Amino acid sequence: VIGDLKCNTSSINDVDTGVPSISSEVVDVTNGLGTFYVLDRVYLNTTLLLNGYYPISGATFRNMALKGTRLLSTLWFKSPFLSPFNDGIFAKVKNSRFSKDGVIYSEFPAITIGSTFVNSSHSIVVKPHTSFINGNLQGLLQISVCQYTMCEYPHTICHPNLGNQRIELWHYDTDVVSCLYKRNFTYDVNADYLYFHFYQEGGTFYAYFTDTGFVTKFLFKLYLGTVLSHYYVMPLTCDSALSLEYWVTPLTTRQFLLAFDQDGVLYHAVDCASDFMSEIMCKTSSDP
Ligand SMILES: *[C@@H]1O[C@H](CO)[C@@H](O[C@@H]2O[C@H](CO)[C@@H](O)[C@H](O)[C@H]2NC(C)=O)[C@H](O)[C@H]1NC(C)=O
Ligand SMILES: *[C@@H]1O[C@H](CO)[C@@H](O[C@@H]2O[C@H](CO)[C@@H](O)[C@H](O)[C@H]2NC(C)=O)[C@H](O)[C@H]1NC(C)=O
Ligand SMILES: *[C@@H]1O[C@H](CO)[C@@H](O)[C@H](O)[C@H]1NC(C)=O
Numbered sequence: 001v002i003g004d005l006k007c008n009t010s011s012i013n014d015v016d017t018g019v020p021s022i023s024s025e026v027v028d029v030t031n032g033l034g035t036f037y038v039l040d041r042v043y044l045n046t047t048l049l050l051n052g053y054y055p056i057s058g059a060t061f062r063n064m065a066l067k068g069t070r071l072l073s074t075l076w077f078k079s080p081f082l083s084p085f086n087d088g089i090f091a092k093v094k095n096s097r098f099s100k101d102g103v104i105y106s107e108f109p110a111i112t113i114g115s116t117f118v119n120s121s122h123s124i125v126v127k128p129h130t131s132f133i134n135g136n137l138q139g140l141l142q143i144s145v146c147q148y149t150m151c152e153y154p155h156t157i158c159h160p161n162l163g164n165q166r167i168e169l170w171h172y173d174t175d176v177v178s179c180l181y182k183r184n185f186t187y188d189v190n191a192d193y194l195y196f197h198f199y200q201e202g203g204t205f206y207a208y209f210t211d212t213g214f215v216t217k218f219l220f221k222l223y224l225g226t227v228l229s230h231y232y233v234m235p236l237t238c239d240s241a242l243s244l245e246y247w248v249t250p251l252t253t254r255q256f257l258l259a260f261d262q263d264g265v266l267y268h269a270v271d272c273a274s275d276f277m278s279e280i281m282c283k284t285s286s287d288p
């Protein structure tokens, strides 16, 4: 259970489909993976020791993507899918460009980040939305942070052209609710992978994003004043045979040594707390 409202409680079984897939690759940041750009600041032809919310070198990712057709498992909405959100998380999300009847699409899972997922708290929801404008497929990314009455079994659905045996249903507030924040963000539907930093500090939530390269740019920030404790990558139901990936590794507060081209491109990094070599390599930045 995520919310605590028995919504459209049909086509649900208790089927064990296993546990989120572990990546064969670990976090290695030795040229950018897991780093972000500084908001309203651009460094050229220089290194820079920097504290921040970075993923842990040697840590694996987990594929939190859940793909359904009609049936949802009750086990999909518990640990280990309903996961702890501490400092933050880093996401490598695949843009599933399923090709059907000539046209190419752009599906990937929604993620909700909250405390209790009840209308008494706020919950962040980062949901993709696709639509055609004269047969050209457009990418949106509907961010919203609201006092949602979340369902026990929240799921999104794919584009209706790919076929759906379920209606989209994650919250039941067809009555208009109190929201701290909501705006849409366009993304390039021709992107191989989308990357996200989601972290919190002193009651403020932070989001970084990129649909080009792996190094994320700043997206938005929002003062909650509360402390976020959980994330859930929602199952996406579809008739078409999509191949979903939402790869997540957690963030902790760490010092990194970053490096920039003359064109301001972060091209190299050192996980400074990973290694006795790395520690030595950073601390030696004070005038020798
Ligand atoms: C806030 O959420 C709670 C549950 O988290 C809702 O309570 C349910 O209300 C319906 C009436 O429509 C009852 O049939 C259920 O038994 C209630 N459930 C529980 C667990 O109490 C409540 O309606 C929501 N209210 C608003 C305004 O969003
Ligand atoms: C984000 O874009 C979507 C594009 O559909 C907007 O959602 C629709 O808003 C209209 C109101 O003009 C409603 O009639 C539709 O029911 C909405 N559709 C969906 C799928 O939610 C939305 O307005 C945009 N959000 C923001 C914050 O601008
Ligand atoms: C309720 O859910 C079932 C299966 O998920 C679906 O067939 C039906 O159309 C849904 N209807 C409404 C109004 O939610």
Ligand SMILES: *[C@@H]1O[C@H](CO)[C@@H](O)[C@H](O)[C@H]1NC(C)=O
Pocket (backbone or CB within 6 Å): 045, 262
């Ligand atoms: C970059 O900085 C170095 C010194 O570390 C300097 O010699 C060089 O002129 C600079 N190159 C560019 C491309 O800015």
